[PDB]
Design a protein around this ligand. Structure first.
Ligand SMILES: [Zn+2]
Ligand SMILES: [Zn+2]
Lengths: 62, 357, 80, 48
């Protein structure tokens, strides 16, 4: 009954991030310039500052 | 002759009903039977334990290999699928549970639906175009399924729809047979219409005491071609037999290696000349354990103990056998019981081949 | 959002007779509706709409679960 | 033994002292704050 779709659906969450006017920006950081990057992170999935739609993001991914 | 008196009956659409006739004829231009129909098969077994019949039923339900239609990762084309309601999860759940009767694992389909109209357009299963593999001389699924629906001006493009193999226990989309009947023909029954007996099961013997050996089992298969029903059902039955034998033969490779230290077999020598054998097998169900317990109990009427405990949260079957013989004699009796199981299912194979013409 | 392809309980192929069962049912209701607004059908207090023979003619067996899910499943196209 | 491998003891032959330990000791004796110590020991960062 579970596998056939009984009480099955999709659950949604949202991420709303804001900027500081002309200080901050959206983009992929680089290791050799930016400071105190989060340990055990994954910055390679970013495309122009945002992860592309349709990819699977897991724990530790930026 | 363990298995006799089998009868097979398909599930067909009654076109004498005007409503169904008109609806089918104006929806799918359908005036005769669908290529694939469900088939109800009723089987009578005599001189066989209910453990074996129930194990055969369980294997035919969700322990036999079976084929479904699945979408490869990246098949759902986000670049082209503009529909906001037909999500990948919903559509792939719809596709996985379409009953198919496939010939090989090479067929690859595709679903390309474009909605150029101003009304919601329903995507049926007849819109699945075979794009890879040999061309089909007969459909493998019915064209009357409702895969989805598109809002006006939307689209749904899915590629790499392949055939995936698995057992029904792991995922329900591989389930094969749906139960329709199970009864014991050698036990009398009360008339349960009376208010005196409606609180009881009906049988005149308690399950704590009864040992029926004459059963009727009726199972329904969801998709079988019309002109080869007897060819399909028979195959299914035969398939089940091999599976059980195969699994039993696995245990037959354990007892043969009782001299060497084997993780799945543990032998103790208890007090009062008593010996103990523990067989722990991972990813086994109540089928093999129940068969083993029943046949060991039949082989050794005066056994001290036997149990087949299958634990849900441990995903394993532990068969404990305590008997007042030596280790060698116990292993000999276990091998004899396994051989009895093998010959019983071989006789089932032969009867299946003999009955269904 | 539609009638399930297979019965949620046992897995009988309900979906392959789903669409037809929808459309045909409508005419049957049109036969039994009677001087009443559509949205007031479940409040008529005089209707005897029985779908036993329709499902039987579809070839679906007399299973409780299968007919329950065939009859009672809502359709998203009909509300949106 | 600037980077990428252990310092080895000439007297015996086994490992002696990892370079980041040397840099950490130098910073600790050189009135280095934690932030000025966390950022400088970033060329020794582990698996990326
Ligand atoms: Zn059902
Ligand atoms: Zn040294």
């Amino acid at each position: 009954f579970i596998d056939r779709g009984g009480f099955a659906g999709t659950f949604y969450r949202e991420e709303k991030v804001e900027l500081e006017s002309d200080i901050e920006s959206f983009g992929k950081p680089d290791p050799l310039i930016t400071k105190n990057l989060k340990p055990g992170a994954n910055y390679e999935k970013l495309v122009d500052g945002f992860v592309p739609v349709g990819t699977v993001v897991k724990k530790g991914d930026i | 002759k363990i298995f006799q008196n089998v009868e097979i009956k398909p599930f067909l659409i009654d076109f004498s009903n005007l409503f169904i006739k008109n609806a089918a004829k104006k929806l799918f231009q359908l005036e005769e039977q669908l290529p694939l129909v469900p088939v109800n098969v009723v089987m009578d077994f005599k001189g066989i334990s209910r453990a074996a019949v129930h194990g055969l039923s369980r294997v035919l339900q969700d322990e036999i290999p079976n084929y479904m239609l699945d979408i490869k990762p990246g098949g759902y084309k986000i670049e082209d699928s503009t529909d906001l309601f037909m999500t990948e999860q919903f559509i792939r759940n719809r596709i996985n549970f379409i009953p198919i009767y496939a010939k090989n694992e090479t067929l690859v389909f595709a679903l390309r639906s474009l909605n150029n109209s101003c009304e919601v357009k329903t995507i049926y299963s007849r819109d699945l175009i075979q794009v890879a593999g040999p061309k089909l001389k007969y459909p493998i699924f019915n064209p009357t399924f409702e895969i989805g629906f598109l809002q006006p001006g939307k689209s749904l493009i899915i590629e790499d729809i392949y055939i995936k193999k698995g057992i029904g226990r792991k995922h329900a989309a591989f389930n094969l047979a749906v139960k329709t009947h199970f009864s014991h023909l050698d036990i009398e029954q009360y008339p349960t219409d009376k208010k005196e007996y409606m609180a009881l099961s009906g049988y005149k013997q308690s399950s704590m005491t009864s040992d029926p050996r004459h059963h009727r089992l009726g199972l329904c298969f969801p998709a079988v071609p019309l002109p080869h029903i007897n060819q399909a059902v028979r195959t299914y039955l035969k398939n089940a037999c091999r599976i059980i034998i195969g699994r039993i033969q696995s245990i037959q490779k354990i007892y043969e290696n009782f001299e060497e230290p084997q993780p799945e077999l543990v032998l103790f020598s208890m007090d009062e000349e008593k010996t103990k054998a523990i067989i722990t097998i991972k990813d086994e169900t109540h089928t093999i354990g129940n068969l083993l317990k029943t046949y060991i109990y039949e082989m050794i009427p005066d056994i001290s103990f036997v149990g087949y405990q299958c634990v849900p949260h441990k995903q394993e079957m532990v068969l404990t056998i305590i008997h007042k013989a030596s280790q060698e004699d116990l292993i000999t009796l276990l091998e004899k019981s396994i051989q009895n199981i093998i010959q019983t299912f071989q006789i089932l194979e032969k009867n299946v081949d003999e009955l269904i013409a | 959002m539609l009638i399930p392809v297979v019965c949620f309980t046992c897995g009988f192929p309900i979906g392959t007779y789903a669409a037809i069962f929808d459309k045909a049912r409508t005419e049957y209701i049109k036969t039994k509706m009677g001087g009443t607004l559509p949205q007031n059908i479940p409040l008529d207090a005089s209707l005897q709409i029985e779908l036993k023979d329709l499902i039987t003619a579809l070839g679906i067996p007399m299973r409780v679960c299968c007919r329950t899910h065939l009859i009672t499943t809502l359709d998203y196209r009909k509300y949106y | 033994n600037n980077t990428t491998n252990w310092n080895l003891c000439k007297a015996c032959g086994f490992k002696l002292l990892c370079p980041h330990v040397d840099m950490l000791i130098q910073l600790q004796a050189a009135e280095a704050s934690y932030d000025t110590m966390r950022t400088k020991l970033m060329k020794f960062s582990g698996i990326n």
